[PDB]
Design an enzyme around this catalytic site. Sequence first.
Site, PDB file in Angstrom:
ATOM      1  N   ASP A  35       0.906  -1.159   0.000  1.00 46.32           N
ATOM      2  CA  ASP A  35       0.000   0.000   0.000  1.00 46.32           C
ATOM      3  C   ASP A  35       0.935   1.195   0.000  1.00 46.32           C
ATOM      4  O   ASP A  35       1.568   1.476   1.018  1.00 46.32           O
ATOM      5  CB  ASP A  35      -0.931   0.015   1.236  1.00 46.32           C
ATOM      6  N   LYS A  62       2.914  11.254  -3.750  1.00 46.57           N
ATOM      7  CA  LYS A  62       1.706  10.631  -4.288  1.00 46.57           C
ATOM      8  C   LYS A  62       0.681  11.706  -4.767  1.00 46.57           C
ATOM      9  O   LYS A  62      -0.134  11.430  -5.655  1.00 46.57           O
ATOM     10  CB  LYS A  62       1.083   9.694  -3.250  1.00 46.57           C
ATOM     11  N   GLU A  90      -7.188   0.750  -4.425  1.00 47.02           N
ATOM     12  CA  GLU A  90      -7.185   0.622  -2.955  1.00 47.02           C
ATOM     13  C   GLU A  90      -8.538   0.084  -2.440  1.00 47.02           C
ATOM     14  O   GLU A  90      -8.499  -0.833  -1.615  1.00 47.02           O
ATOM     15  CB  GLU A  90      -6.815   1.941  -2.274  1.00 47.02           C
ATOM     16  N   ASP A 148     -12.883   5.242   3.373  1.00 47.66           N
ATOM     17  CA  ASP A 148     -11.466   5.308   3.695  1.00 47.66           C
ATOM     18  C   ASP A 148     -11.079   6.681   4.223  1.00 47.66           C
ATOM     19  O   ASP A 148     -11.023   7.640   3.484  1.00 47.66           O
ATOM     20  CB  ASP A 148     -10.679   4.973   2.428  1.00 47.66           C
TER      21      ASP A 148
END
Lengths: 381, 112
Positions: free
Chosen positions: A10, A71, A175, A199
């Site tokens: 991850d 990211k 994800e 999330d």
Amino acid sequence: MSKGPAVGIDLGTTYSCVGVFQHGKVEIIANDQGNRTTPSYVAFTDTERLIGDAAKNQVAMNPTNTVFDAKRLIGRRFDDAVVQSDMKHWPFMVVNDAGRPKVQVEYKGETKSFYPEEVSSMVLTKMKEIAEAYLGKTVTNAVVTVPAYFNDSQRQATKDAGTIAGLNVLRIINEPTAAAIAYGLDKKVGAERNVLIFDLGGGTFDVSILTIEDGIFEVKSTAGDTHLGGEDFDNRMVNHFIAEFKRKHKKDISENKRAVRRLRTACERAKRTLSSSTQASIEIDSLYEGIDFYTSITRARFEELNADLFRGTLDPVEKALRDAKLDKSQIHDIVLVGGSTRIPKIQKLLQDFFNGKELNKSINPDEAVAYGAAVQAAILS
Amino acid sequence: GSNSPQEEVELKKLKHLEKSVEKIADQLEELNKELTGIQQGFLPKDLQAEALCKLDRRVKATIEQFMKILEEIDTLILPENFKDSRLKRKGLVKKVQAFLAECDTVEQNICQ
Ligand SMILES: COc1ccc2ncnc(N)c2c1
């Protein structure tokens, strides 16, 4: 070292996690400091390059040369609205190289620039090494996760980061898909299942709706807030305590960076306590002008301070259901991912929204995405 | 006496912290000696300013280590009856803060 298994990674905004399926179970691998998650940080100094815990541990010493949030840049053009808004808030520089963003730092006394995928390749090298140190075997094969909203360029740049790190990227998976795999939602007997993944972790808030039919996943909709997380909840507690110190002592601590840092560190830990207890105590000796600050906060007071933020997490859920053309009664499974989903008020708001429906939350929410990626890596082996 | 076995655990944590503070304090003393060494040394005025500024990474590392000690000390919850623990904690925080003020003095004398 002999050849080892395939791992699941991850690759997160602020932290990364690596897992391995062995002996009929997923094992999340601790890094060299004994941590089950590793900061997605890379630091450049006068003598070396540092990664993970070693990089985040010296951020206060060298803020301009410590990179994180790569990211947020990966696969993006320099003139992207997200790049322009985000850079204003980072202590490191972001430069334009022929339409592409690059992080610019001072390294071994020289000005050097790196593409976001080069920064992400360093974090992936660290995740690879972490796996190898635990297994005592070489690690080459990996499943790497990305957000469901990532475009072609953002998925390709992530794959290139894996390639530069010497990894054979078996698959790039979403994800929310990895989170559904972790709970074995694709192995449930029956017709098509509609799954909502909530999330809330890493400093981002993502709501995804997927449909699973005979092992096939389809992304129906995505929603959320790119800048919402635990720090915002910590900030509200800091504000509350600063106001409390003014009421009790008629002194303003807000301009003293060290007093605010001591208070902020103690608020982050009190927040964590409030997820399993209904009260937390704080004792900070000589906080400001020799004044000892001994106080407490109940879970109810913490909830009141964050009421708008907690309540606001439901707008993206409503939006996701509208774009998927689904009613809330049509959701078969709800999955909690990200550290902030441990907050009892958030779980309560979400369960009451789904009229008392039980949530999938038994898997450590900070590790659930890596857990699913590890299982997938094993299935692809 | 009312001294409890539970307080021994807290006093043992505080002793370890006092031990780490002594080690950081030794690093601050080596930096003070190195600073004096540059000031009363053989280099001319221009190279002296550059040698002094080269200690910046090291003073910032000492400040950071003292800050992490304060953060570790701030995790302790000591009941009112733990009088020795509370006196030791307060004495350690004040000692660290007096060392932090010496670090600030070094920061104000380099890279100016
Ligand atoms: C890593 O362990 C925890 C524990 C409780 C928590 N409560 C709220 N937010 C968290 N991120 C959190 C993380």
